[PDB]
RNA sequence: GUACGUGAAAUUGCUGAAAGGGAAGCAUUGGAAAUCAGUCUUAUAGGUCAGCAUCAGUUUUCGGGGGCGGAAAAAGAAUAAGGGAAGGUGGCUGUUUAUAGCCCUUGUUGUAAUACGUCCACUGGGGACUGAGGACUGCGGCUUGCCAAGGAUGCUGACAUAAUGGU
RNA sequence: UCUAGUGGGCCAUUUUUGGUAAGCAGAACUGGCGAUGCGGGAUGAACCGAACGUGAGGUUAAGGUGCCGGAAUGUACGCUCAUCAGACACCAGAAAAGGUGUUAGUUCGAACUAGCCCUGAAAAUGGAUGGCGCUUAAGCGUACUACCCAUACCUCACCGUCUGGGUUAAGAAGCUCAGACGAGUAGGCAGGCGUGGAGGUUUGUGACGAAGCCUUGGGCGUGAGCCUGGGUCGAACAGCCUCUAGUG
RNA sequence: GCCUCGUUAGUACUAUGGUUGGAGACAACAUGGGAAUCCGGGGUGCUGUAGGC
C-alpha cells in the first residue's frame, strides 16, 4: 500500500493547469478599513465622471 | 513514521545563519511594500509570529494586501494537477524585495530611454536581449607567446 | 585509420589573463573531432582549462616526412589496467609514426587487453642509432644479413582437382 | 493579358540577379577565409575560423523509452520521428538545449550543398498547416513574400547565411523526413561520436551523413 | 512511429442541426450559401447559431429587445434586431415601442403586440433579403445561463449553489453543514 | 408406407479421391491434380499474356572529365652542392665512395605529380519496382507551334487459349 | 457539464531502508509490462532495437555472416593448447593464493607487475557456447571494409479517420482539391449487419414451386452478412420508409 | 581573529551515455557542472543627516 510512481505522469496528462487570471480581484481578503474606503472613493469617482460627462 | 507538525523537519531551514544570530537588522522595517510588488519569502527564526509554512520558504510571490505589520503574498502551489492560489499573511521580517523585479524595472527604464534617443535620431533601436552569439573570427599573435609543446605525464606514486 | 594531429589552443582571454599562453600537442586520433576531444582531455587534467572556457586556436594534420624510409619508433605510454599502475616503453619498426602508433594500439590490446581509453601515449620518438635500440627483436630485424623463409603460404573454387603443393 | 507575363518575366530576372549575388557572396566568403588562413600560416600566427552559427540537427533514436525532459526538448525542436532533420541557429540557449538531448540527436555544421540538396530534394513548406512540396516559387511567394524571400534560392540564402528572418524561414520549412543512411551507421549507433558512435556533435561530418540519407 | 501529443483531435463543433425540421434545413441551406459565398462574419454567426441546440438558443423578450435597442449612448434604435431563436412576449411592458425584429419564432402574444404597436416581424430568410450581409443589424442573444440547471452546476463546499432537494422546506437539507449551530456551515 | 410433412448437426456404413515414419488442425507463398467463371467473339476501335523503345517517379551499381583546398599535400624523379656516418662497398678485423651505395641539408626542373578532402545548376553506362490521375487551364524551356514542363505512351508479336485469374 | 472503468499491481536503471541471506519485505526519480505485437538475446510479460492500417520497392536499428541460417571458411596484428579449453551485456553464476605454463613488461642473475591458460574446483536419469563441430579458430583483444534484414525510416499505390480550402452550376444528406495520422485490455462513443411482430409502400415473389434444408458451383463486402446456380422440398414470403421487442 | 585574492583543483563529488572493463568491489572513458580544508599574498572599517573645533 502506497507509492508515487504513476501520480506525476497522471498529473501532467492534462497539464499542471494554472488558475485563470482576471483583471480585478475581489476586495475581499483586503483590509476592511481599506475596502470600505475604496467603496466611497469609487462611488465619488463614478459620480465625478458622470457629472463631467453630463456637463461636457 | 512521520509527525506532521507545522515546524517538522525545519531544523536547518529556520536556523539562523552562523554568526548571524541575535538582534534583527532594523532596515527590514523601513521598507515599504505596495500591492503588485514581487517579494521573496525567507523565514526568520527569531520572529515566531506571522511565520509562513515551511513550503513558502524560498518561494517568490506578488503582494496583494498590505497590513499594519504584515504583508499578503500570493503564491501558486502545486496541488495534484493544478495550481492553487495561496494567500499567506507573512510578517515583513520574513519578506524581502526581489532583485529580479528591480533589475527588470531598471531595464524597462533603459529601454524606454534608448527608444527616446532612437526616435530623436530617426533610427531603429535594438531592445530585445539576445543569447550569447557564436564566437567571431579573430587573429591570435604568437609574438613573445611561442606555443609550448605538452606531453602527458608518466605515472608516479605520490600519496 | 589514425592521423597525427597538431592541436594548439588556449583559454579564452580574461581580465586576469589578458595574454593567455598557447599550448600545443601532437596526438593521434581518427579525425579532427576526436583529436580536439583528446587535446582538451589532456589540458583539462594538467593546466586547468576546460573546453567551455578554452578554445582551439590551430588544427593541423602532420604527414610523415619520409614515409618511404624504414625506421624504428620508440613509444612511451601510460597503460591503465585493473590496477592502473603501469608505464610501458615499446619499440616498433615501421615507416610512419601513424603506422607505428596503430601497431602499438593493436599490440597493447592483444597482449595486455588494453583499449583506446586505457592507453595514453606519452611520447613517440625515432631511434636513429642501432646501438640505442634495446629490443632484441628490433635488433634482429636490424641484422645486416636478414633473410628468412616466407611463412604462412596458404597458396573461391571449392573442390580443387589436385592436392596443393603449398611449398616452393 | 500580357501585363502579368511582362511583370512576371522581370520578376524572374530579378530572382536570377539575386541568386547570382548570393553565389558571389558564397564564393567571396569562402575565398576570404582561405586567404586569411594562408596569410596567418605564412606569417606564423593563428587565425581561428568563425564559430558556426547554423547547425543541422538529426534525430537518431526512436520514440520509445525517453525521459520527459529530453522528450519535451525534441518536441520543441520538432524532431518527433527518427531520421528527422532541422536547421537551427547556434547560440547559448540552443547549445544548452542540444546538450540535454545529446544521446538522441546528432548535429553538425552543414555546408552549401547540404542545405541546397536538402531544400531541393526534400524541401517542403508549412502552408496553411500543411506539408506542401516546394515545387514552385509561387508557394514561397505566398508564405514568405512579405519577408523579402521570393524564391527557393532566397530561402537557401536565408538558411545558409542565417539572415534576420531565420526563425520564420526555418519554421516555414517542414522538418526534413530523411531516409535511412545508405551504407549504414557505425557499428554501435548509440554511443557518442567521439567514442566511435553516432550521437552528439560530429562537426562537419553531418555533411557526410546527410549525403548518405539523401 | 511518430511522437504526436494528441491523435485525431475532433473539434467540438456541430456541422448540421440535430433537428429534422425541413424548414430549418432549408434555412440552413440558404445561410450556408450566404456564409460560404460572402465575407459576412454576420452570416457565419447566423449559420453557427442555426446549428445550435435549444438550450444554446434561449428565448428573448420584447422588453429586452426594447431595452437593448433604446440605450442612450448607442444609436442602434432603427437598426433591425436579429435573434436566432424565439422572441417571447413581456406583458410587464404596457406600451410596446415600434420594433423591426427578425427571428426564427415569435410567440403569438409577441407577434400580435409588435404588429399592433406598428413594428414588423420578419423571418431569417426575409432578413436574408432586406440585409443579406447583415448591415445595420443588432444581433442579440438570450441569457443562456438563466436555466434551472445553472442554479446547481458547480455545487460544492462554499460555492453558494442550489442543491437537488425533493422539497424546499425546513426538514430538507438545512441542519448539518448548513448552519454553525449544527456542527459546521458549508 | 402408419418406425409416415419438411428431415438439420453430432454420430455411423458404403463408394470415389487423396494423405499418413511418435498427434492433428492453422496462416503465407507457389507446384501438382481437379474444377469454374469472366472476358472476347464484336461495334477505326476493342480480349489474355508477352518483348523492345522512348519517358516519368523512386532507388541501386560501376566509370569518366574538371575546379578548389593541405606544409598552395608529404614524398619522389632528373640535375647541381655542402655535410654525414654506417647494419662498412671497393680497397686491408679494420676504414668513409673508390671496382656498390645510403643518409642529412639546400637550389633548379616546379607553378611537378599522385593520394586524400571537397564541390560541379560536368558527364557515360548496367539493373529493378512503379504508370496513381484522365478534355483544356499552371510554372517553365524552345522557336506561332514544338518540348523529358501539373502522374505512360509508342511500336510489335503470340494466344485467342483454361492462357491469366478464381476455388 | 454528465458519466464509465480503476481504487490487488509488477519489472528495470540509479539512490536506499529492515534483513545472515533471498526470484525477500519497504520506499524515492524515470522508463517499461499490465494493455503490446514486431527484429535481436537459442528459448522468456517488462533486457537491446523499434512501437503496428493494406501492399510494392529501397535503406537501416539491435544483432549478426563455417553449417543448421539470409549474409566474407573476409582483411591486418597478436595472445591461447586446456586428460573433459573458450565462446558476447541483462544471464543463468565463483574466490584468496598459486604454476620450472607461456607471452610481455618494471626495477635492482633476481625480485616482481601484468594478460591468456591451468590448479584451487567438490553429485546424484543421458545432455547441452542453441546443435554440429571449431585450434596460423568457426576462441580471445583491437582496427578495417563488404554484406544480411524488422510491422522502424524513405518514395509510391489504396483503405479509413481527422483537419483545412472550394462548390447555385449538384441522392448540397451531393460533388471536388490537399495535408497529417493509424498499438490497445477495463471503459466510452459512433455508424452499420442479422432475428420475431406493427403502420405505410413496392402495377412486389409464389403450386410453371413460398419457406426451410444440403452443396467438392459462381459473385459482392474490411467485416457482421447478402446474392446466386444445382439438388431436396411443399404454401406461403420478401425489398424500402418507419414502429416495436422475450432480438444474435 | 576576521574579510578578500590565489594554491589546493579541473582534485573530491556529481547530471547524462555505452551489448564499456571487472566474479564483485569498484574503475576508466564520452558529453556537461564543479567544490572544501591546509597553504601563501593583500586588508584591519566604510558611509548618510544635522551640527561643533
Swiss-Prot record, chain B:
This is Large ribosomal subunit protein eL21A. It is found in: Cytoplasm. One of its GO terms (biological process) is cytoplasmic translation. SUPFAM superfamilies: Translation proteins SH3-like domain. Keywords: Cytoplasm, Ribonucleoprotein, Ribosomal protein. Belongs to the eukaryotic ribosomal protein eL21 family. Component of the ribosome, a large ribonucleoprotein complex responsible for the synthesis of proteins in the cell. The small ribosomal subunit (SSU) binds messenger RNAs (mRNAs) and translates the encoded message by selecting cognate aminoacyl-transfer RNA (tRNA) molecules. The large subunit (LSU) contains the ribosomal catalytic site termed the peptidyl transferase center (PTC), which catalyzes the formation of peptide bonds, thereby polymerizing the amino acids delivered by tRNAs into a polypeptide chain. Component of the large ribosomal subunit (LSU). Mature yeast ribosomes consist of a small (40S) and a large (60S) subunit. The 40S small subunit contains 1 molecule of ribosomal RNA (18S rRNA) and at least 33 different proteins. The large 60S subunit contains 3 rRNA molecules (25S, 5.8S and 5S rRNA) and at least 46 different proteins.
UniProtKB/Swiss-Prot annotation, chain C:
It is found in: Cytoplasm. Disulfide bonds: none annotated. One of its GO terms (cellular component) is cytosol. One of its GO terms (biological process) is cytoplasmic translation. InterPro entries: Ribosomal_eL20, Ribosomal_eL20_dom, Ribosomal_eL20_eukaryotes. It comes from the Eukaryota. It holds the Pfam family Ribosomal_L18A. Keywords: Cytoplasm, Ribonucleoprotein, Ribosomal protein. One of its GO terms (molecular function) is structural constituent of ribosome. The keyword Ribosomal protein applies. Component of the ribosome, a large ribonucleoprotein complex responsible for the synthesis of proteins in the cell. The small ribosomal subunit (SSU) binds messenger RNAs (mRNAs) and translates the encoded message by selecting cognate aminoacyl-transfer RNA (tRNA) molecules. The large subunit (LSU) contains the ribosomal catalytic site termed the peptidyl transferase center (PTC), which catalyzes the formation of peptide bonds, thereby polymerizing the amino acids delivered by tRNAs into a polypeptide chain. There are 2 genes for eL20 in S.pombe. Belongs to the eukaryotic ribosomal protein eL20 family. This is Large ribosomal subunit protein eL20A. The lineage of its organism: Eukaryota, Fungi, Dikarya, Ascomycota, Taphrinomycotina.
From Swiss-Prot, chain D:
PROSITE patterns: RIBOSOMAL_L30. It comes from the Eukaryota. It is found in: Cytoplasm; Nucleus, Nucleolus. The keyword Disulfide bond does not apply. InterPro entries: Ribo_uL30_ferredoxin-like_sf, Ribosomal_uL30, Ribosomal_uL30_CS, Ribosomal_uL30_euk, Ribosomal_uL30_euk_arc, Ribosomal_uL30_ferredoxin-like, Ribosomal_uL30_N_euk. GO terms for cellular component: cytoplasm; cytosolic large ribosomal subunit; nucleolus; preribosome. GO terms for biological process: cytoplasmic translation; maturation of LSU-rRNA from tricistronic rRNA transcript (SSU-rRNA, 5.8S rRNA, LSU-rRNA). The keyword Ribosomal protein applies. CDD domains: Ribosomal_L7_archeal_euk. GO terms for molecular function: RNA binding; structural constituent of ribosome. Pfam families: Ribosomal_L30, Ribosomal_L30_N. Keywords: Cytoplasm, Nucleus, Ribonucleoprotein, Ribosomal protein. There are 3 genes for uL30 in S.pombe. Component of the large ribosomal subunit (LSU). Mature yeast ribosomes consist of a small (40S) and a large (60S) subunit. The 40S small subunit contains 1 molecule of ribosomal RNA (18S rRNA) and at least 33 different proteins. The large 60S subunit contains 3 rRNA molecules (25S, 5.8S and 5S rRNA) and at least 46 different proteins. PANTHER family: 60S RIBOSOMAL PROTEIN L7, LARGE RIBOSOMAL SUBUNIT PROTEIN UL30. Belongs to the universal ribosomal protein uL30 family. This is Large ribosomal subunit protein uL30B. The gene is rpl702.
UniProtKB/Swiss-Prot annotation, chain E:
Gene3D superfamilies: 3.100.10.10. It comes from the Eukaryota. The keyword Ribosomal protein applies. Coiled coil: none annotated. The modification Phosphoserine is found at residues 15, 63, 135. One of its GO terms (molecular function) is RNA binding. The modification Phosphothreonine is found at residues 86, 88, 133, 137. It is found in: Cytoplasm. Keywords: Cytoplasm, Phosphoprotein, Ribonucleoprotein, Ribosomal protein. InterPro entries: Ribosomal_eL18 (IPR000039), Ribosomal_eL18/eL18-A/B/_CS (IPR021132), Ribosomal_uL15/eL18 (IPR021131), Ribosomal_uL15/eL18_sf (IPR036227). One of its GO terms (cellular component) is cytosolic large ribosomal subunit. SUPFAM superfamilies: Ribosomal proteins L15p and L18e. GO terms for biological process: cytoplasmic translation. It holds the Pfam family Ribosomal_L18. Component of the large ribosomal subunit (LSU). Mature yeast ribosomes consist of a small (40S) and a large (60S) subunit. The 40S small subunit contains 1 molecule of ribosomal RNA (18S rRNA) and at least 33 different proteins. The large 60S subunit contains 3 rRNA molecules (25S, 5.8S and 5S rRNA) and at least 46 different proteins. eL18 interacts with NAP1. Belongs to the eukaryotic ribosomal protein eL18 family. There are 2 genes for eL18 in S.pombe. This is Large ribosomal subunit protein eL18A. It comes from Schizosaccharomyces pombe (strain 972 / ATCC 24843) (Fission yeast).
